[PDB]
Amino acid sequence: MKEYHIDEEVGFALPNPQENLPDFYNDWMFIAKHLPDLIESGQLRERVEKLNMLSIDHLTDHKSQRLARLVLGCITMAYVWGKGHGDVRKVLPRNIAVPYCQLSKKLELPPILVYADCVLANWKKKDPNKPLTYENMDVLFSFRDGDCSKGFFLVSLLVEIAAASAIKVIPTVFKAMQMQERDTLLKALLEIASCLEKALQVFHQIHDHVNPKAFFSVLRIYLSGWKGNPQLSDGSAGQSSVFQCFDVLLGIQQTAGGGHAAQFLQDMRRYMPPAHRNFLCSLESNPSVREFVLSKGDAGLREAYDACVKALVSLRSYHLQIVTKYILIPASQQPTGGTDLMNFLKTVRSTTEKSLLK
């Protein structure tokens, strides 16, 4: 499906991403690289304002353009937030502004650190002929020390990658539908569910690598989309495609409704690469797997469909426990409306659960 920029092995994630910019952008790299210390000390802001307005042109191809969105990305948040206690003032200088606001409008992304940046493009396997495991993976850019931004980015990543096993049968699904192949479609739906259960195991690792109290107080403030004030020019899991992909594959209508829950999810598409946005919709353009599976009156097909929905609902429900442990509890011990959030996340679990057909 490579015109949508999906990869057999590594899903929506950018495969084997650039980790060296050109030389002309050695200025940029050596802020971003040594960024735990520039924030800690305070000589980050210093060093950004004491810089020049580099052109984006020398960035040739995609992989290189995207690394640039990352480097500029971590720099922007770190600059604007600072140490993340009071200093959060003062809009970016036009040194970093125009590149980011140029390169963002080029790659059709927002001028802001997104999932596509800080997870998808933000990794490398250390020993190039070793497997996609936690040992043999590391991120390109952290923010502080003990922000657990390695564990976080990489567990996030490894889920995209488990999902990649399911995503890659989806043509087999739509193929076997139009060509009236019950047996083919049936296996294809058990494959998906059997992979989406695999996706939950990877998810368990979050406990192991990401520290609860660390994440809340330290790291999340730099991924907080539009907290603060941009003040530049004319005006992060859950920006993931993985969940909305299979929302749509299984004809589960989240974004259909007159509700906040729904519109939030459809807005999240604007934080995705354009190619993924494109992909998602293509799925919607296709005949409904849900409606098809219903018409046939085939007990074993509903079973294999209900298995994919089970699998999703499973993921969503676990996701909540993770939020309890990594937001709610930590959020308490931190000297009104509060958590409508858990409403939101349930409202979406709920809606997925409703799409079961016994």
Residues lying near ligand HEM in the complex (CB under 6 A) are found at 155-156, 159, 206, 210, 215, 237-238, 240, 242-243, 316, 319, 322-323, 326-327, 341, 345, 348
How far is Cα 142 from Cα 122, in angstroms, rounded to an integer? 10
Residue 71 vs 348, nearer CB to ligand HEM: 348
- Of 18 and 236, the one with the shorter C-beta distance to ligand H7P is 236
If the CB atoms of residues 1 and 342 are measured against ligand H7P, the closer one turns out to be 342
| Binding partner selected for residue 257 from ligand H7P, ligand HEM, none, CB under the kind-specific 5 to 8 Å limit | none
Among ligand H7P, ligand HEM, none, partner that 45 touches (CB below 5 to 8 angstroms by kind): none
Question: Rounded CA gap, 113 and 120, in Å?
Answer: 12
| Distance in angstroms (rounded) separating the CA atoms of residues 302 and 193 | 13
Shortest distance, CB of residue 309 to ligand H7P, whole angstroms?
25
Residue nearest to ligand H7P (CB): 226
Q: Which of 357, 352, 353, 350 is nearest to 306 (CA)?
A: 357
- Residues forming a β-bridge with 11: 7
Nearer to ligand HEM, 93 or 212 (CB): 212
Q: Which residues contact 84 (CB under 8 A, 6 or more apart)?
A: 218, 221, 222
Q: Which of 150, 80, 155 is nearest to 112 (CA)?
A: 80
Q: Which is nearer to ligand H7P, 85 or 126 (CB)?
A: 85
- Two tokens, residue 192: 């998906």
Which amino acids are annotated as binding site for heme b, given as ranges?
Answer: 319
Which residue shows structure tokens 């005949």?
A: 287
* Nearest distance from C-beta of residue 243 to ligand HEM, angstroms: 4
Task: Select the binding partner of residue 250 from ligand H7P, ligand HEM, none (C-beta < 5 to 8 A, by kind).
Answer: none
Interface residues with ligand H7P (CB under 6 A) are: 220, 223-227, 236-237, 327
- Using CB distances below 5 to 8 A depending on partner kind, what does residue 206 bind out of ligand H7P, ligand HEM, none? ligand HEM
Nearer to ligand HEM by Cβ, of 124 and 316: the residue is: 316
176 contact partners, CB below 8 Å, separation of at least 6: 184, 185, 188
Residue with the CB atom nearest ligand HEM in the bound state: 238
Classify residue 238 as exposed, middle or buried by CB count within 10 Å of its CB (0-12, 13-18, 19+). Answer: middle
Residue keyed to tokens 């720099």: 75
95 binds, among ligand H7P, ligand HEM, none (CB under 5 to 8 A by kind): none
Shortest gap between Cβ of 260 and ligand HEM (angstroms)?
Answer: 12
246 binds, among ligand HEM, ligand H7P, none (CB under 5 to 8 A by kind): none
Torsion, Cα 181 187 193 199, to 10 degrees, reads -120
Residues 140/117, Cβ–Cβ less than 8 Å: no
Half-sphere exposure of 84 (CA within 13 A, CB side): 18
